[PDB]
Amino acid sequence: MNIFEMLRIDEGLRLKIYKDTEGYYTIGIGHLLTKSPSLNAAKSELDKAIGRNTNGVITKDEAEKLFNQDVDAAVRGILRNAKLKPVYDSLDAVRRAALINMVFQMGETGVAGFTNSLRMLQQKRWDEAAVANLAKSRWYNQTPNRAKRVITTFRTGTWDAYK
């Protein structure tokens, strides 16, 4: 188990341009191409990124490279975030993966409003309240399992919820 695996489980790995939950072009492991309603824009974007004429189709090898960059991008951004940076600083490799996963699914901003609840999943004092609070989220509501698996990781620091 690693973050690549975890996100394939959670977000899935698609080798053809697809629309996301908001009707945007995406490829691979949630890699958004463009906000443009236009398919050709999406393909220009994709070829520039891939460095070849892909015609909307990429390899498992190219998706993973994309994915790595995006992960490094999220890290950079996490570290630039007043609120997040610290939490992050703290976390072990597994728990970091859980956060990065949230960031992926909701962004630096979606995830900065949980800081606290996040902080507490880890404190025996507040941990049960933290969870409760997280379950009242839309986030959990829309994607219950993913959320459930994310939280248990965070709480446990293991990958058990992924096997």
For the chain, the structural domain boundaries read: 1-163
CB contact at 8 A, 99 and 91: yes
Amino acid making up residue 154: F
Say which of 11, 45, 62, 70 is annotated catalytic: 11
- Residue 47: active-site member: no
Distance CA 82, CA 144 (A): 28
The data reach a resolution, in angstroms, of 2.0
Q: Please give the structure tokens belonging to residue 106.
A: 């909701």
Distance CA 108, CA 85 (A): 10
- The answer to the question of whether 44 is labelled as a binding residue is no
Method by which this entry was solved: X-ray
Say which of 20, 72, 89, 160 is annotated catalytic: 20
Q: Which numeric CATH code is attached to 1-163?
A: 1.10.530.40
Distance CA 52, CA 102 (A): 31
- The answer to the question of whether 117 is labelled as a binding residue is yes
Q: Which ranges of the chain does DSSP label H, i.e. alpha helix? A: 3-11, 39-50, 60-78, 84-90, 93-111, 117-121, 127-135, 138-142, 144-156
- Residue 92: active-site member: no
Tokens 């691979």, located at residue: 28
- The answer to the question of whether 68 is labelled as a binding residue is no
> Judging by beta carbons within 10 Å of its beta carbon (0-12, 13-18, 19+), is residue 33 exposed, middle or buried?
buried
- The answer to the question of whether 67 is labelled as a binding residue is no
